[PDB]
Symmetry: C4
Subunit: 511 residues, 4 copies
């Protein structure tokens, strides 16, 4: 009965849950959906979407409303509800930083700018972001987080909670770093040796070592060390996997640090964050860029040999749903949609104007399909054998290289039969496909609004035979056969529309 | 267990109901919805709208169909039904005047123009309005009203009925005053001393004292004294608060008296009516002017230090619903929509072509929101601490000054998140906000189709902190907490859509 | 317990049913809806429409399928069903003529053109209409009709059946008369004395007496005498009222006889039919002319001092519904819509493409309204005191003279409140009003999509007072009060929309 | 209690089921709807459509997954379900050929191109079609088919299964014939004597006898003999009727053999297939040509004196539904729509994008109408006395010759009453009519979106009388009368809309 753990070796990764790889199919409630009196607007939405994991804020202001006086009653209530509604949990520690700011820190923290000081701009102004350099703020956050992880260990031997997110989009808007004297005395000092090593540099001060990027790298290092110390102390009580989430900078035309949240784990300081954070298992992007080229580039930059891809947040508008499968195709640990409840809040223009059964349906389709084979899909991801893709506007055909023997053509917006002319694509980009290689000649295949045409990748497989195309579902790891597709259903690839269908396809050659 | 009473001192007012301030959230049935056989088309509409007070006609013709033979059986039935359906009552005495005319007076009154004479025009014609100068008509109305108030005292110790409206839009169409000899002998006489005092004038006859306005002021005085005598005699039996309602003249381009109902409490004879009517607690406007500038000007003119604002009637078309909150913002006693039943009558073009759940929804939203905190809202109004505003077409932003420390920006038609560009306003003007100052740093806030952004009003509060933003409801005066809004839900003001939500917002500063 | 009877004296008429005047609010099933196995598609439509009288074919071919072998089992079944579904019946004897033809005569009649000969054209051709001159055909029809009326007397002491229609649109298409030798020997003879008397003519042969109209008048006389003899023999067994129905000729631009059904009771041979038919109580028009001027002219021509108006058939398209009230305004005996069942037959373009709750609603509204006061309305018609009108396209205002004291203005398509501008009319012509004078100052008033404004018709009533405007219903002749309309509901006339409402309006004058 | 049998003599044909002629009103499930776990998406669609016969694949790969190891469990389950849901079955043997290919043959067949060789092109390439010349493939298919028919005999004494289809669209895409040496040695040989006889030719080799068509005729003969041998061996175990289905070549502009499936029973090798296949009862077209002229021409070419017409497959788009009645008008054995289940597969553009109650309704209408008289309709077809027609775009009138005495005019898109102008046709071509001659003067008539006007075909019947027009249904062969249509319902022909109605019309003449 092992607890959840994150493993990563030689560029292959797994979130182990109950002793086997697990893929997070996640939903995050809105930021103020973290009280008993509002949960009856959370669970009905989850029942429609059907995530296997729900992200919920655990606010520092609610568990330590007065210093030393802890209250974990909402954690207790939430664990009971998640167990009743059959989901795992990822708890979000809203503390020193939530979207750069201290708004979720307790009254006795965020109103006391002397004991818990804010970042000071170069021009001398205090701004709405707590300085990472103050020992008092670190001590207070870590104490509450330690008490949190101690409580969790006592009341969750079921391991309902599988990961913790310490802080939420840490970083600073409105200044590249802290310019207070306390900060400057550290910025004037020598760059720590660990960072010199990891960055392949020569010793010196921050200004000497990093030049024009010293301010931003200093801030990223200082935030990273701050959260790493919290993660280390919490893991000493209850060593759940832990990750931080990034408010992104633009992948192609980023602004200046401070326009984006400086110091957060943005795509230019990933090495700094890895060096600062040996106790942080991964750096997760929060992706609200609906354009295909931007979204998929962010996925590629955060999927590294030293970083399992977890899309911790993404939009809940219907065009976002299709990005689930390409995310899983990077063989990370999963993907989560943000803003899933019926509280009538909307983060439009980032997300949907409303959350209801219609807006959730495109998301539920993928969650249902993956859930039909989640443990085999997760095993495949743990071995780097998952492939996934989403439809790009203006391109009705994609090619997926599977292995030496087979490839898959993905065609969007076509009939499930012979068609004349070039594939038109779906009227809106809504298609996706997901393929796991189970063995060299057998694949798990699902998709929607799309045709998947497996075909030979070499002369050795030119004489292709469909041996079986079994529709069915897995119970855990046991395959439950429904029917063998054949005839019209495989003559023009295998075609998916709007219902979740999993196909276990065994290929052969005639000899 | 005190009876209802109206208190007013130094420009602050309260309708005391069950020993505490009360705000009327009212609905008035149509003019012929005052019989047992039609009430099953009243209560289903009230169940949807959810008023806390219902206005119903009590017709002189129904309670004294023959002289001396009183019948209060409908009053009895109505009290039972209002108690069953959990509303308070305001009873409208349809007697000497209903919309200037005697149509609701009994057969033995309105067919006898000798004993109960009509106004005579300057040219000698009797018109459809009873003369205020006839002692017989005053005596007969007052007798029936006294018997009415005696009956009410006996059968309503519960105080279901909280106010009485003697007469209904008294005044005269088609003549500025009565020109009959009976009238002229009074018009030739000396202006009574009380009116000379209140009007800051020198003694004389009506023509000497008031000049070109003598005819209209004489008529207003004479009607005012007539109704005051009825109110005084009724209050001697059962001293419920009492008010009269005004058919309005145009605020900017009024016609001549007689085109509008001359002698009624129009905005140019309010002092005359106050002098004539020490036993009439307030002069209430009936507002069927949907244009923002006209509607809000009428509110300002009738909200005086000597006159608590009560909007006794207003339209039931959807654009009217938003005027509830600016009305309450004048710290009067409430607001009532006219024409609320399912009898299939329509007073379009003044009001809605139909009354159903769709047309009532915009009204129900505000009634539900205010009802969630009605007694605290009424306490705030009794202290002059209520603020309210409605959306004006072409203006997407309003500013509300709250106190020395805080103000509120009201923004219409915007996302509940960051938006680029100037606020567009709602496509139709439908937004409103209502704010009560509970203490210098704590406010009750609700609105719809609107964003409320509290912000510093002085250098002393520049370092603004949201201490709590508690969503919840009051049970009487006891606050029932649901959740604390934070994060996305307060980063861009607090945003309201189409559901009733009450926020108790405590502000702080970091130090 | 009297049987139904028709009375007519000095231009005033009544269908007496159960000892008092009765107004037929009728529905006729389609022509093949006269068998047990199809009645379950009749009664559900009647339940929606709510007629008080249903017309049903009784086919000669079904009650005498072989000569001498009578079968009245469907009559028995139908009486049971009409009693169960609470309607009266008018039975249509489909025999020698149905729409000019013998198609409903038994096999042994309509296939035997020797014993039962057809009309012969001038050029020698037999056409699809039976000759009225053959004694064999008269004898056979009359025998079956006598057996029919004998059976009815035995099995209907309840008087479910209130009238009989002998034949159905008798007349001849394709020839003005019979030109066979049998016919010519009668045409050559002397005009019978009774017809010479009634037509104010001098004796002679048909050609001498009537000139160019001799052929058509001869045919009308001969058909009239034929049916009169059947009616006389049937009435001798069971003297129910009896009427014949007319396929109309054009009121303004009629064709030639034979294009229209020559010999039928068309508007130019009404005197001939009255002379030929002393045992036929009335001549009823079948009106499928939707244009206002044509429809109302037909009503005027068939409403005579010697002819009570009964609209035996009219269209079931929605524009026809409004013609009910002007029909009743001629103080005849009622009005019936044709084609009322759910068999999925349509007589479009004459009638509606479908029969369902939507197409029936405009008809049901009037039937419900009249049924709320049917016996008082019928009493008023029996005295010539009913007034009715329907909306004409392009005319939004009509005036109804009621008596010396009062008139009514009918205004179409206006608000139920003050409106600026000229009345626009309803977008389609759908309005109607019905007014019964109960006494000189009291009226029964109903309407739909219309305003009724009673107003003085003389200087004596200039000082008009609404004494009562009672909404309610009658149970038999007992008035059941609901409420008194007043205020807004009578300030702009009394306004009717889409629900059935009956108002008993007592007018007064102030003195 | 006879088993099903096919009889054909002198150009008249019958499928005898339970001892009497039977007309297949068929539905075929999709190609992968042949497993227990998917049948719950078959029967709900059949319940809506209401076929009397369902076609289901029986796949060689499922009944002999390993050689010698038979498994008929799905056959057993399917028989139980068809009996429960009250349909007959036609089982489709998916074996050596399914749409030219071996995809439904077992693993040990289709992956072994040595023992079970594919067709070789002229240029030397193996293509996806099994060669008919290999004795091993014939032996293996026939063995499995024999075991299949043996099993069926044991478990289906109820005769739920009425026909078998050996193979499915046999033929070859991509080559006119096999060019392998094995094939060429047969092609070089002498044409068998039976084919020389039937083709009215002189002896010789294939190239000598048939010239430019030798390749295609050789292939058709070789496939025909292959399947005939299977049919003969299966019939020896259980002699159910058997048929083959044809992937069609274009009727007017066919491509080359190999573009269409060469060797299949295309319209140019019907004589070859008749000569090769004395044990194959008929050659059935699969018609996915929606254009009227192409569809009806295919019907005419496959309806031969030596070939009963069975439309084994046709489209499930709504325009196809109307082709049922003209198919039955060729006096064959029935008609079946392809793709009838709720699995969410679509063979659009050939068929409908979706299968649901709306898309099935036009098909269900005809199935319900024919089912109301199926055994009399089948008796009439067995005697060549069925007549049927469908609406052609641009032609609103058709004439059907019935016999010497009567004809029927079919008019599309007109009212059920008199209309002015030329018939417009239905907006889309949707009408059809079906007429059985029961005796010289009595007909069974049904249709939809159409008028049927019976009229004289000779001077002897000029004096036409409708004797009876009985609406009703048959229970087996017993007529159950509902009503006699007359009057309006027969004055303008008999008119059909969207509900199933069967009329038994007896015609007479008056004398």
């Amino acid at each position: 009965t092992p607890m959840p753990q994150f493993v990563s070796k030689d560029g292959k990764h797994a979130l182990m849950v109950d002793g086997a790889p697990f893929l997070i199919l996640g939903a995050q409630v809105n930021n103020s959906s973290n009280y008993p009196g509002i949960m009856d607007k959370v669970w009905p939405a989850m029942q429609v979407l059907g995530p296997n994991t729900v992200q919920v804020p655990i606010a520092w202001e609610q568990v330590e409303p007065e210093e030393g006086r802890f209250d974990f009653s909402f954690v207790d209530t939430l664990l009971n509800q998640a167990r009743e509604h059959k989901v795992r949990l990822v708890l979000l520690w809203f503390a020193t930083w939530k979207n750069n700011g201290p708004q979720y820190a307790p009254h006795w923290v965020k109103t006391d700018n002397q004991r818990f000081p804010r970042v000071v701009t170069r021009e001398g102004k205090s701004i709405g972001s707590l300085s990472p350099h103050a020992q008092a703020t670190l001590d207070a956050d870590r104490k509450a987080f330690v008490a949190f992880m101690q409580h969790l260990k006592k009341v969750d031997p079921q391991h309902t909670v599988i990961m913790i997110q310490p802080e939420n989009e840490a970083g600073t808007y409105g200044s590249v770093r802290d310019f207070s004297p306390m900060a400057q005395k550290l910025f004037d000092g020598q760059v720590p040796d660990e960072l010199i090593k990891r960055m392949n540099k020569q010793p010196g001060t921050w200004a000497q070592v990093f030049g024009a990027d010293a301010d931003e790298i200093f801030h990223a290092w200082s935030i990273g060390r701050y959260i790493d110390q919290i993660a280390q102390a919490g893991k000493a009580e209850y060593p759940l996997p832990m990750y931080v989430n990034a408010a992104l900078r633009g992948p192609f035309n980023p602004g200046q640090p401070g326009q984006y949240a400086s110091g957060g784990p943005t795509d230019n300081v990933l090495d700094v964050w890895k060096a600062a954070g040996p106790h942080i298992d991964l750096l997760a992007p929060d992706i609200y860029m609906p354009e295909y080229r931007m979204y998929t580039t962010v996925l590629e930059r955060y999927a590294r040999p030293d970083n399992a891809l977890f899309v911790a947040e993404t939009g809940n508008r219907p065009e976002y749903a299709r990005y689930l499968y390409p995310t899983l195709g990077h063989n990370g640990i999963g993907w989560s949609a943000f803003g899933i409840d019926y509280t009538r809040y909307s983060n439009y223009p980032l997300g949907a104007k409303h959350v209801n059964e219609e807006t959730l349906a495109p998301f539920a389709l993928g969650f249902q399909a993956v859930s039909m084979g989640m443990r085999p899909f997760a095993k495949a991801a743990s071995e780097g054998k998952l492939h996934g893709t989403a439809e790009e506007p203006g391109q009705a055909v994609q090619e997926l290289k599977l292995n030496d023997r087979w490839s898959a053509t993905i065609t969007y917006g076509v009939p499930q039969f012979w068609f004349k002319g070039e594939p038109p694509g779906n009227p809106e980009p809504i298609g996706a496909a997901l393929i796991a290689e189970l063995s060299p000649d057998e694949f798990l295949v699902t998709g929607y609004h799309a045709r998947v045409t497996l075909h030979p990748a070499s002369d050795a497989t030119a004489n292709m035979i469909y041996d079986r195309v079994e529709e069915g579902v897995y119970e855990g790891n046991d395959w439950k056969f429904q029917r063998n597709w054949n005839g019209d259903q495989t003559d023009y690839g295998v075609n998916f529309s709007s219902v979740p269908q999993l196909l276990k396809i065994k290929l052969a050659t005639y000899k």
